[PDB]
Amino acid sequence: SPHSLRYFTTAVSRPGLGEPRFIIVGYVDDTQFVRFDSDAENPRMEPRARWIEQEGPEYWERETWKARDMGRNFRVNLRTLLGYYNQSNDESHTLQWMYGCDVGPDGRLLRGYCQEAYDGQDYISLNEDLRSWTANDIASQISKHKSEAVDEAHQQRAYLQGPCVEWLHRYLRLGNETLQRSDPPKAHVTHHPRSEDEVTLRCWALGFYPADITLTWQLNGEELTQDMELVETRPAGDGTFQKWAAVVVPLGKEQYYTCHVYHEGLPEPLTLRWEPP
């Protein structure tokens, strides 16, 4: 509609310990549904959405063992990269891996992702063809060369084209009521003096799902302002999201400005402006 299943994996080395901290979170669209944290109480794959609690112990046992296996491999990978970069074992380093599938309205794979970063920088990524890799420096070239030798691409491609899509379909069925919905935003404009003769107008969108949204401001008769303060879309904590966008305008000219709110749940945008009480 479209939809996606994505996993986000993070391994952090700890100079002065054995095991790195290893975390996995899984998402369908904008909803986190599973988490594994090696340092947790306890270190198993566990639910983060009510609807996944529908899976039997077999599911939970198998994902926990896969998480544990991946953690061991990420431990190895961190040590391997220390070597590639000639780095010492007295500092912390990070490996991140994001992967998953986007599927279209007909339930078919639109694109697959499989990419890693070392210390927050692009390391290696599976190309859109799902057949070849992009490296970013000498170390990642070695990794790329190794993955070509063992045909890793075909293993990841098989997953992304098959099980990833199929599991996404299962999850969409399990969590249909919350995943397959649009809650449109409710919006209002607030007014806050900024100086003697300037006012901050803030256009709020609240209670919306999914997270994608766009707010625009403009002076009536002109193109959209670029001079706009925004915040990153943020979780309300109840499965919906919030966002706001602000402009500073002259006192007494508040109503010459208009905010529009666009969202998948709105056939037409909401149109708002400051209304004195």
Binding site: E63, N73, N77, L81, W97, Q156
Partner: peptide, 9 residues
């Protein structure tokens, strides 16, 4: 469900 294996870098 998660991928079966990760890359060996």
């Amino acid at each position: 469900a998660m991928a079966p294996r990760t890359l060996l870098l």
